[PDB]
Amino acid sequence: YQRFEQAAAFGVIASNANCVWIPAPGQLITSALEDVNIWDIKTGDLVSKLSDGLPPGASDARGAKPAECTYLEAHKDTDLLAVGYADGVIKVWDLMSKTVLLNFNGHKAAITLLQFDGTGTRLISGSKDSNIIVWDLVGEVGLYKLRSHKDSITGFWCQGEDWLISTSKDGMIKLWDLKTHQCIETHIAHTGECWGLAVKDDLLITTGTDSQVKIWKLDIENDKMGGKLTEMGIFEKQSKQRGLKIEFITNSSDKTSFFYIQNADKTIETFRIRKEEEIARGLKKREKRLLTEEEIAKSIYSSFILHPFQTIRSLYKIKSASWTTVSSSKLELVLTTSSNTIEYYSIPYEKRDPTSPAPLKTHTIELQGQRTDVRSIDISDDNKLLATASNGSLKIWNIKTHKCIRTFECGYALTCKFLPGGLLVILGTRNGELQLFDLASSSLLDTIEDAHDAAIWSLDLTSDGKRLVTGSADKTVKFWDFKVLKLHHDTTLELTDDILCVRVSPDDRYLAISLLDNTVKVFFLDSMKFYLSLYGHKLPVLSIDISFDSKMIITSSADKNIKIWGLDFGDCHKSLFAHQDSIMNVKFLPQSHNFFSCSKDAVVKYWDGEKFECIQKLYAHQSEVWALAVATDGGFVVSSSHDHSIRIWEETSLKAGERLMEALDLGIAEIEGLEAYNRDMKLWQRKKLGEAPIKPQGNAVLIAVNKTPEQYIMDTLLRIRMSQLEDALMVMPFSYVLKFLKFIDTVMQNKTLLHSHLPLICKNLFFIIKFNHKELVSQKNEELKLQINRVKTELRSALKSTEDDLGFNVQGLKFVKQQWNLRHN
Amino acid sequence: YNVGKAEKDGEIRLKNGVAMSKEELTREDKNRLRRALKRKRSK
Amino acid sequence: QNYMSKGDWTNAFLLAMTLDHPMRLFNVLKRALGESRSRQEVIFNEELDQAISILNDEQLILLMKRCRDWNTNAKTHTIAQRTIRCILMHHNIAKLSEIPGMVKIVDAIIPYTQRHFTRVDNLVEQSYILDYALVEMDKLF
RNA sequence: CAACGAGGAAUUCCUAGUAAGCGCAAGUCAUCAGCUUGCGUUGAUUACGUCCCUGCCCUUUGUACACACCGCCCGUCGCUAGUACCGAUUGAAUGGCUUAGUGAGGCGACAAACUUGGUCAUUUAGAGGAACUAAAAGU
């Protein structure tokens, strides 16, 4: 089969992520969906769209949504970009050659921050699962995993090798000793969530849910448990919503610091922090009226040391920000908003006055977007493309360059079409209005106010284009002719119910209209004849399509299935269940009975109309796919969605006993090696100190598991089971019995792990010598005789030591019970 | 005497005789113990 | 958590008793008991058994409930016996009797201590095969 | 001037009156005589252990009452409940600001109520997406 693929994607400038700024104002790296695009603020042309080397839709593209980019981060000097995605992976790229250097999956959910540390070679990553991982770049390895938070990492701040401090989506801020990787000090920052974190070395600043911004003093050289990070006071903001990014700078040329708190909605609150001279010379002024009350007033600090500034607003909802500064009169702040647009503002400040009633944007990159979801897409013969929006941003992109060359202002527009000669656009809006535009001249040929009484929903041209059909939610359809380039309403068919889709056949033959009452009706255009009524869909029914032979129709709806109907008798053929949310649109190919259907669950699907298989399951969008349009000839198809994206699609085993035996042999070999080393040390300290042994290096597995040999043998002796212990001790020969006795003799000198394993040592040792008693009493060596005596003394001393307190506790507890009885029985 | 269940719902006492408290135990051991008593409540 | 990491078992014990974290209480008592066997009237270190000596009625009733259901093991029973012993030798016996609830605990854990006394006494009994093997090894010449 | 002197690679079955040798009868509503089923006679070798290999199965709270022994099998994905997030729903509405007119009338200034753009708090009819956390079996 000649399958499909994706040629190019566009329409997005700023998506659901952050932005990093690079100096030359300068350029900006930001996120499109799953690929990062670089822009020069000066002009705004797309100078780079760094993307994955595999086209989404190819043979090896995997059967899920692609990983949406969620955090940009940049290493400036060594020229790296660490980007992180919504499944958890982190791709690190060199920006010179634009290839992937590092893949760092690691996490389990989407990631929320990156940070390079010690400028190169170390990257710390926090994610929507509460872990925070340190990575080395010279080893390609997750070094450490700091794991004590509970919801989702909202920010952190690190210095090199000793202290990190994170704050998460519970109420908690935590300080981490990066030598031991244990959390040191935990506080409850804000009572709900904790969304912000910034720090200029003395003071730390956090924000939570609603306007309560908390100043903290971190004293890194503290020694008390609670008190490495103390809280110094709160203050308020003007926004009652989630402040969710705070960031600081030190402008040079005197020395000064500024921080911003961006908000949820539309607003960045900027602040100047003042200096120690005006701290000292402002203390007395609130220390006037002359001291318990004055001490309470001096303790109740935030408004003192912090100074609000020019509160920068924007048109839309704010997603991310970052700035640069010179002179303290060029606080130059780039800002990516949610409805895709970046904006370069810059506030001046003459070091006492901010010199403006409201700040000024110096640049704005917004041309290649829409600010809303594209409710209707369309195409030319093959050259141009039509995107219809809610703000009014009709845009005429072109296929061969992916640039909007022409844009207008219409309104809440939901359907549109071209006109068959090209260079002319019809459109209907969500109120009772229709509109006409072109390509060479300006916007409005004419609008028709009161084109319909209520919301228009779907229009369609005839194949010659002279006559179009508009169906609207005022329970009417209307017909319009083109008189000479103006619209002529002549007839109107009022139904009983809100018509919400129209279509004609591609050979002027049928008019199929989809009502809200779960059905469609097929009429003859030449008679308004009411040929057919197709019924049985069971929810209100979206897009129709008529085939090229005018024999076979499709019918999509919110019932998550598309129905194929034969139009000769109105008989159904299939009722195939696709698309687990809602099929928004469905369109045939030009010459074939194959068709496409794009749906409200971020997927388009390629089907055939003969076997009714699914030919292909294309998976490049991230959210609700609102429209798709097929080429008139050739058959490449564009699809446009809710994530502001527009994309093109073209054609192509030991056991117990022997485990204990090998553990006993290596353990006792290490033990008597160290004892020979100690005898060598005593002889070379008691004789002429001219020589000694060189070094017994400790065993590989013993230093690998970090155990003394008594502990190593003790835990494998623990790890054999009680059912095969009498077999594990019976398998081993008498030489291993003798070194087992050496092991017991050494282990009852370390009286810690003697007393924690007394009945195990007793059971094993007594079975061993009870089973091997005949040979043991025939061995002739005073070393083993002294060994048995030493084991006997220490073992019986431990056992009588534990039964002493057992008997003490018996007599004491029954005395307690008996004196309670003789008190009040 | 024998070790029964816990007397309040802030802790559990296993038959062993050792006890965990809900707040004190880690979330990995809370998943492990939920799975364990789910099996013990499934057989 | 910081005390349990860095050592320091007495203030760790009283914080585990205040928070009522019973597995951590067993760990701080087991670790302090093991290091008490290691180093060298007093059975824990002196600061910790003074900290046991100065706790009040409801704290020692929850401590003895913990000792009660640790004594049902034959493994975790030594820690329970050392804690019962330091309570007995650092508190007043009339106070311990007249605390409301301290007979439904000590009647629960008299027979378990008797069971353990029988078991450890039989271990001492069958510990004399070493003595028999030594008298044979000395008869060998 | 054809075959053949105990039958290759592979493969199947078999543990005591058993394998195998031996003959003699019958011919029982199905089956069998190109044979089938009985009946006696002679009668062994080697295992009778083991889960190492190949597989098949069972259990993973000890429950069932003492004594004694043991002393938390593990992971993934789902289900249920909660907590915040992401936007689209001309969300729509309330209320206050504020957009600009219509302004009856009190006293030609003044003007309660009606149209009509943005700001703040809340509900979504509700439906999506993709996160985190919690979850109780014991006379």
- What distance in Å separates the CA atoms of residue C127 and residue A794, rounded to the nearest whole number? 11
| CB-CB neighbours of A112 under 10 Å | 23
**A80-85 β-sheet, strand order:** A69-75, A80-85, A90-94, A100-103
Q: Which nucleotide is nearest to C76 (CA to C1')?
A: D71
B18: nearest CA partner in chain C: C70
Q: What is the DSSP string of A319-369?
A: EEEEEE-STTT-EEEEEEETTTEEEEEEE---SS---SSS-EEEEEE-TT-
- What distance in Å separates the CA atoms of residue A205 and residue A229, rounded to the nearest whole number? 11
Beta bridge partners of A565: A553, A572
H-run or E-run covering C78: helix C77-90
Cβ contact C113–A806 (<8 Å): yes
A263: DSSP letter: -
Q: C58 by DSSP, 3-state: which?
A: helix
Contact between the CB of A724 and strand D at under 7 Å: no
C-alpha distance across the termini of chain B, in Å: 25
* A675 token code pair: 């004892």
Asked if A593 contacts A601 with a C-beta cutoff of 8 angstroms, the reply is no
Q: Which of A199, A170, A202, A203 is nearest to A187 (CA)?
A: A170
Contact between the CB of A241 and strand D at under 7 Å: yes
* A305 token code pair: 């040391």
Residue with tokens 């605390």: C99
- What distance in Å separates the CA atoms of residue A56 and residue C80, rounded to the nearest whole number? 65
For residue A818, give every residue at least 6 positions away whose Cβ sits within 8 Å of its Cβ, in sequence order, or none: none
Q: What is the DSSP string of A136-180?
A: ETTTTEEEEEE---SS-EEEEEEETTTEEEEEESSSEEEEEETTT
* A251 token code pair: 């402008």
Q: Determine the residue type at C127.
A: S
A722: DSSP letter: S
* C60 token code pair: 């020692």
User: How far is CA A266 from each of CA A206, A307, A343, A349, rounded to the nearest angstrom?
Assistant: 20, 21, 12, 22
Asked if A376 contacts A414 with a C-beta cutoff of 8 angstroms, the reply is yes
User: Please, is A77 exposed, middle or buried when counting C-beta atoms within 10 Å of its C-beta (0-12, 13-18, 19+)?
Assistant: exposed
C128: nearest CA partner in chain A: A792
- What distance in Å separates the CA atoms of residue A264 and residue A240, rounded to the nearest whole number? 9
* A740 token code pair: 């087992």
Asked if C66 contacts B11 with a C-beta cutoff of 8 angstroms, the reply is no
Outline where DSSP puts E strands in A516-603: 519-524, 532-535, 544-546, 552-555, 563-566, 571-574, 583-588, 595-599
| CB-CB neighbours of A483 under 10 Å | 10
Asked if A627 contacts A377 with a C-beta cutoff of 8 angstroms, the reply is yes
Q: Which nucleotide is nearest to A109 (CA to C1')?
A: D131
Residues of chain C whose C-beta is under 8 A from some C-beta in B?
19-24, 26, 66, 68-73, 76, 107-109, 111-112
Pairing label, strands A306-308, A312-313: unpaired
For residue C65, give every residue at least 6 positions away whose Cβ sits within 8 Å of its Cβ, in sequence order, or none: C105
Residue with tokens 């019924």: A535
CA C17 to chain centre: 16
Asked if A82 contacts A95 with a C-beta cutoff of 8 angstroms, the reply is no
For residue A718, give every residue at least 6 positions away whose Cβ sits within 8 Å of its Cβ, in sequence order, or none: A757, A760
Count, residues in chain B: 43
Q: Determine the residue type at A6.
A: Q
H-run or E-run covering A786: helix A782-824
Asked if A427 contacts A408 with a C-beta cutoff of 8 angstroms, the reply is no
Q: Determine the residue type at A612.
A: F
Q: Which of A168, A82, A77 is nearest to A125 (CA)?
A: A82
User: How far is CA A158 from each of CA A56, A83, A228, C63, rounded to the nearest angstrom?
Assistant: 37, 19, 15, 42
* Phi/psi-derived region of residue A765, left when phi > 0, alpha when psi is between -120 and 50, beta in every other case: alpha
Q: A545 by DSSP, 3-state: which?
A: strand
Q: Which of A670, A661, A659 is nearest to A696 (CA)?
A: A670
Outline where DSSP puts E strands in A567-633: 571-574, 583-588, 595-599, 604-607, 614-618, 625-630
| CB-CB neighbours of B10 under 10 Å | 11
Contact between the CB of A151 and strand D at under 7 Å: yes
- What distance in Å separates the CA atoms of residue C107 and residue A666, rounded to the nearest whole number? 49
In the PDB record, what is the listed experimental method? cryo-EM
A440: DSSP letter: S
CA A756 to chain centre: 47
- What distance in Å separates the CA atoms of residue A495 and residue A716, rounded to the nearest whole number? 85
Give B23's contacts in chain C (Cβ within 8 Å).
19, 21
- What distance in Å separates the CA atoms of residue A384 and residue A401, rounded to the nearest whole number? 10
- What distance in Å separates the CA atoms of residue A758 and residue A84, rounded to the nearest whole number? 54
* A164 token code pair: 């990190």
Return positions of chain D under 7 A from a protein CB: 53, 59-61, 63, 67-76, 84-90, 119-121, 128-139
H-run or E-run covering A811: helix A782-824
Asked if A32 contacts A69 with a C-beta cutoff of 8 angstroms, the reply is yes
User: How far is CA A716 from each of CA A565, A719, A752, rounded to the nearest angstrom?
Assistant: 73, 5, 17
Four-residue CA torsion sign, C91, C92, C98, C102: positive
Asked if A711 contacts A699 with a C-beta cutoff of 8 angstroms, the reply is no
User: How far is CA C89 from each of CA A197, A805, C77, C93, rounded to the nearest angstrom?
Assistant: 53, 11, 18, 9
User: How far is CA A588 from each of CA A148, A506, A561, rounded to the nearest angstrom?
Assistant: 54, 11, 16
Q: What are phi and psi of A341, to 5 degrees?
A: -170, 135
Give C2's contacts in chain A (Cβ within 8 Å).
184, 225
Give C137's contacts in chain A (Cβ within 8 Å).
776-777, 779, 784-785, 788
Asked if A54 contacts A65 with a C-beta cutoff of 8 angstroms, the reply is no
In chain B, which residue ranges form alpha helices assigned H by DSSP?
Answer: 27-40
Q: Which of A236, A251, A237, A262 is nearest to A345 (CA)?
A: A262
Asked if A375 contacts A626 with a C-beta cutoff of 8 angstroms, the reply is yes
- What distance in Å separates the CA atoms of residue A594 and residue A512, rounded to the nearest whole number? 20
Q: A495 by DSSP, 3-state: which?
A: coil
Angle formed by the axes of helices C106-125 and A782-824, nearest 10°: 160
CA A89 to chain centre: 9
Pairing label, strands A519-524, A532-535: antiparallel
Q: Which long-range contacts (CB under 8 A, 24 or more apart) does C134-141 make?
A: C134/A785, C134/A788, C134/A789, C134/A792, C136/A777, C137/A776, C137/A777, C137/A779, C137/A784, C137/A785, C137/A788, C138/A785, C140/A777, C140/A778, C140/A780, C141/A780
* C39 token code pair: 């180093």
Q: Which of A379, A368, A373, A376 is nearest to A636 (CA)?
A: A379
A589: DSSP letter: -
Asked if A602 contacts A620 with a C-beta cutoff of 8 angstroms, the reply is no
Contact between the CB of A242 and strand D at under 7 Å: yes
For residue A816, give every residue at least 6 positions away whose Cβ sits within 8 Å of its Cβ, in sequence order, or none: C88, C93, C96, C97, C102, C103, C106
CA neighbours within 13 Å on the CB side: how many for A787?
Answer: 19
Rg (CA), chain C: 18
H-run or E-run covering A460: strand A456-461
- What distance in Å separates the CA atoms of residue A232 and residue A642, rounded to the nearest whole number? 45
Helix, strand, coil percent values for chain C (each to nearest 5): 75, 0, 25
Contact between the CB of A169 and strand D at under 7 Å: yes
**A413-418 β-sheet, strand order:** A413-418, A424-429, A433-438, A446-449
Residue with tokens 């955090």: A71
A63: DSSP letter: S
Q: C113 by DSSP, 3-state: which?
A: helix
Angle formed by the axes of helices C77-90 and A782-824, nearest 10°: 50
Chain B residues 3-42 with Cβ under 7 Å of strand D are 4-6, 9-18, 20, 22, 27-37, 39-41
C-alpha distance across the termini of chain C, in Å: 61
Beta bridge partners of A245: A262
Q: What are phi and psi of A617, to 5 degrees?
A: -125, 85
| CB-CB neighbours of C17 under 10 Å | 21
Q: Resolution in A, one decimal?
A: 4.8
Helix, strand, coil percent values for chain A (each to nearest 5): 20, 40, 45
- What distance in Å separates the CA atoms of residue C79 and residue C40, rounded to the nearest whole number? 18
Q: What angle do CA A385, A55, A6 make, to 5 degrees?
A: 25
Q: Which nucleotide is nearest to C23 (CA to C1')?
A: D72
A17: DSSP letter: S
| CB-CB neighbours of A198 under 10 Å | 18
For residue A801, give every residue at least 6 positions away whose Cβ sits within 8 Å of its Cβ, in sequence order, or none: none
Q: Determine the residue type at A438.
A: D
Q: Which long-range contacts (CB under 8 A, 24 or more apart) does A123-130 make?
A: A123/A82, A123/A90, A123/A92, A124/A156, A124/A158, A124/A164, A125/A84, A125/A90, A126/A153, A126/A155, A126/A156, A126/A166, A127/A88, A127/A152, A127/A153, A128/A152, A128/A153, A130/A168
Distance (Å) from CA C90 to C1' D89? 72
Cβ contact C23–B18 (<8 Å): yes
